[PDB]
């Protein structure tokens, strides 16, 4: 139960929630610090070669 059915995972964040009347229903505001720590692996392709290179 504590290690197989449910386990701690990476690429996750926790913090207090606040109400934003100026945000869309499907949008969630993410703090800048949390965004910097969390990462997503994007495969380099001809379509994103320029964009990905700039980030590096």
């Amino acid at each position: 139960r504590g290690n197989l059915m449910g386990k701690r995972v990476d690429f996750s964040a926790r913090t207090v929630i606040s109400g934003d009347p100026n945000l869309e229903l499907d949008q969630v505001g993410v703090p800048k610090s949390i965004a910097k720590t969390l990462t997503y692996p994007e495969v380099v392709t001809p379509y994103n070669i320029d964009r990905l290179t700039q980030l590096v």
Partner: peptide, 19 residues
Amino acid sequence: AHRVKVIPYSTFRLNLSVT
């Protein structure tokens, strides 16, 4: 599932209708 929106300050933010 939500769509990320990077914002200033130390808290998350979400619409009132989804509470």
